[PDB]
Symmetry: C2
Subunit: 105 residues, 2 copies
Amino acid sequence: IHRSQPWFHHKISRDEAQRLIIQQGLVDGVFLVRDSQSNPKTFVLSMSHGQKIKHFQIIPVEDDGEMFHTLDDGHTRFTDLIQLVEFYQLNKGVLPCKLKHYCAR
Amino acid sequence: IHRSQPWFHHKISRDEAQRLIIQQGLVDGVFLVRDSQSNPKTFVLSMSHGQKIKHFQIIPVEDDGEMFHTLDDGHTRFTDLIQLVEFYQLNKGVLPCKLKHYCAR
């Protein structure tokens, strides 16, 4: 379902993701989400902050027969990537800063 | 937009909200959201926990020309009530427990 979102970049490499973020001038909050390069399939949040690029693995966690997505070891859970992104666009949580400007697909 | 959600009860009184929650057997997590009885219009989250009913005011807060909704003095912000509810259904935050079972409209 997240495949339709403008901030999701279907399977680009880490280097490619970094190139894009870097070419935005390393402004805090620039970001994008992409598919994991490793298997099983999880997801990765790539963003810039403090003139550096940070990657956060988005993993699936279970609880009472249900699976959720998280990037802070389950302390903050989400049903899908859309809910997770829109949450982090307004609240930084464990992130160095909020998700302010997504890279264009 | 939240007006369509099954957990939102358009303008019922506090007593009515408590009657409904109480008649569910005071199970932790039972809840509902309703319009504020006071003006200006804000919103109220009514839920049961520990055999008691708790009401949390959902207020609007501003930041950089934008308005958000919150129930913890802006520490956790949301664009609308739907995002706020779906977040609290999975994460308790400052609430005594998660929003588990909404009362039927």
